[PDB]
Amino acid sequence: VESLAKSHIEGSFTNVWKDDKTLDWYANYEGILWKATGVVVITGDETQVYAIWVPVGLAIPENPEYGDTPIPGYIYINPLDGTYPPGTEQNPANPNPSLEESHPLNTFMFQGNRFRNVNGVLTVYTGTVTVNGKTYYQYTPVSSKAMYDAYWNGKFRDVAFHSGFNEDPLVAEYQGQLSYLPQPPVNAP
Length: 189
What we know:
monomer, mainly beta, Minor Coat Protein, domain 2, 2 domains, six-stranded mixed sheet, globular, viral protein
């Protein structure tokens, strides 16, 4: 079963999930765990992901009728891709993640990711982190150029500039650049 030196898969996978820390997408196929690389295209409902699936390890099972034509979707922006690294000349943003005791206010949802904008500085919700007995909420600086480009080009003007006591995240109108996922998924049962 140690066959994870497998050839990459360029295609769509169903039964995907996103890791709450790395914000990468994942799928189990042929008893192998795959990481979605290259240009990653996801359906609006996140049931399917199209990418260059790289084998990263052995499958974990704990973590629909299909056509043969391309289905609409969105180019997923992994906001932790490193194309615009924080704490650099290019990106002067503080490069350190914070541990919030509660979710910060006025955050927004984009591609199922939770973002906080503090005067042009973007941070992303990268899961909970239990520290000395309690649930903290980690917010990691955004290192994606495509994310900042969407922001700068006003693709979040509707959700990124709110102030006031607004605990629940708003949901952005813009959900990414439109693309297509080839069908059916490679791992269809």
